[PDB]
Amino acid sequence: RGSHMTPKDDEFYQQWQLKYPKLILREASSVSEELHKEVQEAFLTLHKHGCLFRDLVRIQGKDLLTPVSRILIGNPGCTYKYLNTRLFTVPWPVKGEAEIAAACETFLKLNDYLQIETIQALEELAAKEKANEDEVDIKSRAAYNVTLLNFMDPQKMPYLKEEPYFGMGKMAVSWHHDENLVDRSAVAVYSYSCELEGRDPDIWHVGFKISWDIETPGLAIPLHQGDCYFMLDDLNATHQHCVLAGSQPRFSSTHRVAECSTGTLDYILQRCQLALQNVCDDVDNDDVSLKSFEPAVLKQGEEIHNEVEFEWLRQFWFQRYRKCTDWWCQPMAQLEALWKKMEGVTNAVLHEVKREGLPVEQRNEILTAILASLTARQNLRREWHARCQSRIARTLPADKPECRPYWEKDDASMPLPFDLTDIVSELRGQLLEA
Template sequence: MKRRAGEREKELKKKKLLEQLGENRLPYMTPADADFHHLWKTKYSKLIFRKSDAVPEELHQMVQEGFLTLREHNCFFQDLVRIKEKDFITPVSRILIGKPGCTYKYLNTRLFTVPWPTEGYDIKYCSPQIHDACKALIRLNEYLHIEAIKALQGQNLPETKEIKDSTVTDREQNFGVSLQEKGSVSKDQSSSVPEDDYGSLKQRTSFNLTLLNYMDPLQMLYLKQEPYFGMGNMAVSWHHDENLVERSTVAVYSYSCEGPAMEGSNDQKLKGRDPAVWHVGLKVAWDIETPGLAIPLHQGDFYLMLDDLNMTHQHCVLAGFPPRFSSTHRVADCSRGTLDYIFGQCELALQNLQTDPDSRALSLKSLETAVIKQVEEIHNEVEFEWLRQFWFQGKRYLKCTDWWLNPMAKLEEFWRKMEIMTSLVLSEVRKKERIGEQRNEAISCFLIALTERQKLRQVWAARKRSVDLSGDAEGRERRPRLSFTSAWPPSERCQSQAAENLPEDQKPECHPFWTDEDCNMPLPYDLEDIIADLQNLVQWVE
């Protein structure tokens, strides 16, 4: 609900801004403008930019070879995302690489990291070259972590004054560059941050994953035009990055495959940004007074968005002519997005399941409403935030590694036990000997979780529906309701029109899915009849 409310608020703000503009366009500046640096220092000082010569050549070579390797192995994928209840394929192709077991969710799609080589984890890559590419991105990650700490210290934020991190010096020496800050950036007026309000400097710069992007604009049939400033073709629309630790840094390394004919068109008398060159665009969020920025990006340049810049400002990526890779390093908020977290949730739920030592029959330890609610919510989380999200992306991850298959199989085993637990709750609440008020409370709580499950299954895999006006097994009158027929598919997200355009091995799979003939499942996939019966039971008890 909060996400939908946020999306509606953004749409209203966007609509209002466009109405204010009418046919006009807001001003923006590039480095060619006389007031560009003054604007940057006064309104965008938490954006730090470094040209490629600031990065060790050895690191450039490793990372750029890694990009090309991943492209050669077809490891970049267009994501199927959902915006305002509609599915879209992203124009940019992506791959998420990072700590084993981490995920990153954006636009209602959860991406699963291709794990970079990590001590203590057995990670089998599909080729040694993919291993080397992932290893190169760890090196880049470490380098950008160091640069982010230095940049934050240069901002003179209150919480940076006491930070002493010896690991910075140690790692910096590995790359053979000094700790001396290159250039200076004046402090933004909004830089004053209460020292105790946020996490440590190190936590907000310890990137746990990187989202790699690739796009060849000349292969795109259509690119959206930037709507506010008239900056030209956009590869990525205006946005704030989602699902990040608050006030954490975002670091972006850019590699556009420029050749002699692609170095820009400085000889042309162009007003505004050079359309041949990739740019990052920035603007103050929902502001029509402050001019925007368009900063050119060349091979090996990188930039940092520090502190609260991602919250107070928006950014976009403006397409040039050549193909471009980027590696966007983030401190993703993984409080609910790691395997450790979801396995812990499963263990918590399964504590309520017990096995008779003699008969091996399964039963529930507790039928307290709070326990039922907790278990069924975890059940929904495992099914819709993990299992369905993973298989929704087809078999794309097998292009790089099979690492995720074992943990997902384990999660599915836990989920099947939770299906049994749901059937056990259902049997208990249907017993007439249960006390009326307690029974009614348990049914009402149970209904909320099952109704949510049914609604989400319809989103992921909807069937043709018909109206049922019949009564129930005990002759009580049943309200008109929609029920599913046996016509499978089509489905919503898994077989949307957008999904049809994906390659065969990337097309969504509706999993888990079963039919009524599957005797291994304790409950039907379609819960509509069960929900209707429980609704009638609540009325009957009352």
């Protein structure tokens, strides 16, 4: 059953209506030639300045480079995490170089145009579903807060897998569901390419299959120069999708409702600010002393610590994003500061855990409360320091993955060592002690 359809087959349009009716396709006419123009140089503007980057992802246990170059434009302070990798937004000119400032702006226009299109589609989708058997839900599933711009030149990048279930040709992006979206939220894409049985291998497509199902014939939508398609509602969860490479270079602007409830700057700042509620905070120095050693406060402390380190600092310093935009340099330098003080708190606790006159029963309580996070912290320091210095990250330019923050045991500037194995095996020792 290696079968697919395209508009060349008449079966295709009914297989469309009653398998994938949550796929929408508005041809380039639904977009002014003035909007096409402004957007298509916003792509080049961004591509000239060299903003886009292949991503060093990690799927299952293996590190891979993404065939596609990618940049993320969106609400300032917002982030989109996929494949264990967090992208940070190059911000666009909403509430609050010369070229870049206007490029990010264009897409915000693009983004607002699409958002309108997505609402009527979704109003028309609830309407078909009233003639047979809330409109703020619908507005919220269309409030795109970010767009992931995608680029590929099929000629400068001729290392492509073939589509295995249906024979759709080579793939610029393999079968997948989109991660980290608001539930039932829509995804809208502007596709921008340059210039007999099966699908046409010179032209770009988006593929679609039912999950778990390589029998029902896939779909293969042709995408030409300013075409748009929309994934409505549960589509991205009921269906897998892919991209099928054409012959010419191609941009795509893919607009999402990223689920950044724990993936925004204002959120991770506030966790730090809560963590540091246990710090006697009169003056910023390294006489870190803590108000409480209540075991729930310490646990919460050490957990926020891990989150800023691994979810924010290590994720950021695995990337660069320092060409078009610099928005994150202050915030990042400020989370390093908060992170560093916390390494002090952890120090404070280790001292407390070992103080002469603390009845072991209370020291076993402090331990048991903090051991998990301090052991998780070690294991991720390894996974990072490995994934960082996999020799696949030396090949990348001087423009390649830092392993940061990293200090070395003969570094009086850091209170505890970077390798906690002795400290943690030493904690576990006490707890088992009779």
